[PDB]
Amino acid sequence: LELRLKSPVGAEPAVYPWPLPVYDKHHDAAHEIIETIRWVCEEIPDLKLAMENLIDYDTKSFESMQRLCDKYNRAIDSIHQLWKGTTQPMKLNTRPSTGLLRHILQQVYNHSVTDPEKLNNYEPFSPEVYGETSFDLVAQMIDEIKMTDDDLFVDLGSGVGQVVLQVAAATNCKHHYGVEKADIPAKYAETMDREFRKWMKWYGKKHAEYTLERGDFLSEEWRERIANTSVIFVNNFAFGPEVDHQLKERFANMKEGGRIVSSKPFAPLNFRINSRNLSDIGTIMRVVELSPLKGSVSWTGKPVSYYLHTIDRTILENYFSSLKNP
């Protein structure tokens, strides 16, 4: 006893058991199905036409849901016949739109994070405190911090890996990495990885290369990896002064133009270079606050902020030039 959705591009159908599972208070498989059909309709205008010709969905009855799926599946067959005619088939090889990606990542997450409660079982007041950066902040990061095929992206402390997946889907960096130390999120990230590749194949959408790794970003191996990374993302809000200090040491080896996006600044925003602070990491970076997304508040009730650091040794060079002057 099952529900099936055919892939728009001929991948293996998506199959859902009955009764349909629930993911949390605001997400279940029934609505995932309905939204998936909605989104495939956005990918294919012709399919959207066929679906207009709409019905009552209850989400409680098998026959009603089996009915909805059958109507979608029949419309998919016909579109597939259309593509055998003269009609150009949906272009493959494209990136998903923002709206489609959101849905894809929610879907991947719901299928991968089988017990979301388990992510809260970290040692409190430690660097392992878990918190998820929202899809919208990542989207803003992607928009403002323009990346090219020259860039290498790393999420330091990548959790279940969903920041990496979003960036990999939206940009053409040569490679994207996430590294995560804790067992529970790193275990989930393995399923996130498989579900992402599967679902992206299912929709016929491409992503850049990425790897999700278990590891410790303070390790010897990671010193060099960090030095060669051009865009670092790091949700360091709960890392603490010790870990932040260790990261500063790693960042001091980065190249000009290297960028770090973080939820807590690595240097003060008003940094004034002088004779006492010569070795502070502030001597080699510009730090700006990224614009808050309209009406977004933190647990502090203040607009949640992220910070962009750009490696710029020009700061230091200019100070030393000034010392050869009046």
Ligand X SMILES: Nc1ncnc2c1ncn2[C@@H]1O[C@H](CSCC[C@H](N)C(=O)O)[C@@H](O)[C@H]1O
Binding residues for S-adenosyl-L-methionine: 130-133, 153-162, 180, 216-217
Q: Does 180 bind ligand X (CB under 6 A)?
A: yes
Residue 262, both tokens: 């973080």
Residue with token string 């989400």: 59
Q: How far is CA 302 from CA 59, 126, 184, 294, 297, in A?
A: 39, 23, 30, 12, 5
- How many of the chain's residues bind ligand X (CB under 6 A)? 20
- Binding-site members are 130-133, 153-162, 180, 216-217
Q: Which residue's CB is nearer to ligand X, number 200 or number 234?
A: 234
Q: Return d(Cα 308, Cα 128) in angstroms, integer.
A: 23
DSSP 132: -
Residue closest to 31 by CA, chosen among 43, 46, 44, 16: 16
Q: Which letter, b or e, does each residue of 237-255 get, where b requires 16 or more Cβ atoms within 10 Å of its Cβ?
A: ebbeeebbeebeebbeebe
Binding mask 78-117 for ligand X (x = CB under 6 A): ----------------------------------------
In this complex, which beta carbon is closest to ligand X, that of residue 87 or of residue 134? 134
Instruction: Compute the least distance from the CB of residue 312 to ligand X, in Å.
Output: 25
Smallest distance from ligand X to CB 159, Å: 3
The site string for ligand X over 111-130 (x = CB under 6 A, - otherwise) reads ----------------xx-x
CB of 255 to ligand X, least distance (A): 22
Window 126-155: contact mask with ligand X (x via CB under 6 A)? -xx-xxxx---------------------x
Using CB under 6 A, pick the residue from 8, 96, 185, 204 that binds ligand X: 185
Report the alpha-carbon angle 64-69-70, nearest 5: 95
Q: Site residues for ligand X, window 194-253 (CB under 6 A)?
A: 216-218, 235
Q: Are 21 and 29 in contact (CB under 8 A)?
A: yes
301: left (phi over 0), alpha (psi -120 to 50) or beta: left
Give residues in contact with ligand X (CB under 6 A): 127-128, 130-133, 155, 157-159, 163, 179-182, 185, 216-218, 235
